[PDB]
Amino acid sequence: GSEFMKITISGTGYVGLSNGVLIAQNHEVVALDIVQAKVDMLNQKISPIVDKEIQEYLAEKPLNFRATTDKHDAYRNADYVIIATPTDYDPKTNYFNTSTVEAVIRDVTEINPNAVMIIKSTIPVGFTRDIKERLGIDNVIFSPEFLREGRALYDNLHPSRIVIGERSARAERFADLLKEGAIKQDIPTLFTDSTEAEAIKLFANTYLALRVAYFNELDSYAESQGLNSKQIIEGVCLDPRIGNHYNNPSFGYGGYCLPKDTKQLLANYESVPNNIIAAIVDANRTRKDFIADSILARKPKVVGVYRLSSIQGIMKRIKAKGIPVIIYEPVMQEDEFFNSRVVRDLNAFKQEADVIISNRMAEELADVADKVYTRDLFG
């Protein structure tokens, strides 16, 4: 009976909780977490994470949602179990820690072998086909998540698309759950085989890194040649095949996904001839070298870093040349970061820095704009 199902969420971070609150509008959702304090909060309709829509829906909407620390209570009778536990890929060792996902697969297989597991956690390419073969089970399907931390429920209410890594009626019924709870209508939906679904986010994020790296190389050329980067970029981006988005120069692509995913994809190309995949990684190092060299050519005695992630790579290079860096970051509470002073008073920071670097311009740097170096054009 697909009319009213039980869906268990294993993992209460933004991915699991966003999916759980979305589905609890129409089905029975039970959230499993190992931490009793998190379970008690959820049962009191308090979100353990910061996400405005998740907190609003938990507090104000009638959701058939509850939490528990009991695995048997959580998995028994579940039609689907969404696995959204933490995973991490380390590019230095090429190790992808999937232990939390494998622990859930172990527990569901033992407690309810008829449940269909949907992995939303990030996993390595080929993970699902391999784990099914290893354990001799069939009830595991991967589905990528395209959510932004802080707007995770909003992104599930208005998704770019839904992709489920199995071609079957049970995969389509899970996609239907995601569409039923959404506000956006006629959401693009794609069903693929397993390993293909697991490769989508690495190829999508690596294209975004390539696009930023390309506009950054155009910007390196414009600076080197004394040209106006904004004029060139706006003219280029008026071609509708290119578009006016994701084209703002910076000190390099950063954030929590692009640096690691581009490297993870390159490792997957160890036996595949390529030049672009490897260049996306190299390009970022070259761009940071160019930006650092431009700053160092101004012969500053102290460089001020306004806000703290590619700017970290710039700071590293400036310090390697023996020039002190001071940091302005109101969110940090320590007085030192990577051996550099964190200055609390903005006016003291502005006065001492000979060049203030910022990945993006800010209103509060307006009065010292003359000594601000930023390649931001569009805000």
Place this chain on the structure above:
Amino acid sequence: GSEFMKITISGTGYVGLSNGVLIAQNHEVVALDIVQAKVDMLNQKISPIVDKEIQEYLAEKPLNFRATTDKHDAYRNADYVIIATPTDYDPKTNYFNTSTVEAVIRDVTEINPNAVMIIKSTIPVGFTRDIKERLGIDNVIFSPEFLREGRALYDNLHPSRIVIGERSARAERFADLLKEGAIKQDIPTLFTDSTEAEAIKLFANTYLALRVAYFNELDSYAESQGLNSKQIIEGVCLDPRIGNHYNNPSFGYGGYCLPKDTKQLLANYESVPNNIIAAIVDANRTRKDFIADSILARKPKVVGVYRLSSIQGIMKRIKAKGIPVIIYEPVMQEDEFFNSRVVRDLNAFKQEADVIISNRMAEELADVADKVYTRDLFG
């Protein structure tokens, strides 16, 4: 008086004639060409080139348009002279032949020094700033053309954008001429400085080559790993920041612009640190090596090339390994191309070829689809 101006077109290829017919709907246009036969045809309202809309407008619309071989008749009293003469960049020697453009600048400067020249021909980055300085003149402005041969007047009637490489009222009046004749309304219009305008097409075409090269590397990986490329590409391209266009795998980017422009841009980066610009060129060689290797692994005794431009690079590599190639190309009338037989009978071609390669699938290859190798997914 901008109400009714005289605009001379120097060059009657698709760029000059498209611009001339567009502007002749509202102003006086005089086309100058060195070839008397071309002038006589134009005066009889016959187009010397193949372009449906150009021929329809010349024959059916009231255009204030005429042609002449007399430079004095053509340039005298002109408010603007559009320079659309042939130019060519040779990547092997890094030589950009701009002789025809410099000859027009010479003639207009002597005959009518008050005319404002608009260069639409492709020229090297920095050309206009340098020629103005060299000759001591101010009346030359570059404006990129974004036209497709065969639909050149259509692309001027519905342009992606208009970019004029000078910030001035006389530049804006020329943009107004282009907008007045167009069918599309509220056309995006950008005014830039000179060298910036000259760099736009190289950066736009190189992004398109990068995009094709990236989807081709994704395709190399999918083939190498036994995965369905279409599933991965459709999932990736459903991200609206990426889009479902210009994402069809092929044997490499080709055509008349991308191979040369990517190399021209790389030459311009001789003193600018980069990895992506150089990788776009290298990637195409690597992709052609991958495609050739995939074909050669099938141990064919004869490879059939269905239609003739990246497939040429594949043919070169197959022949380097000592395997004969036969070519099916109805448009060619010779029986040999680069030392390979051109076969006229499609059934004879199909029977003799052990593997038939085609950059895109075609209906007439449907009955031999089993031995057809193509990476086309979308048509």
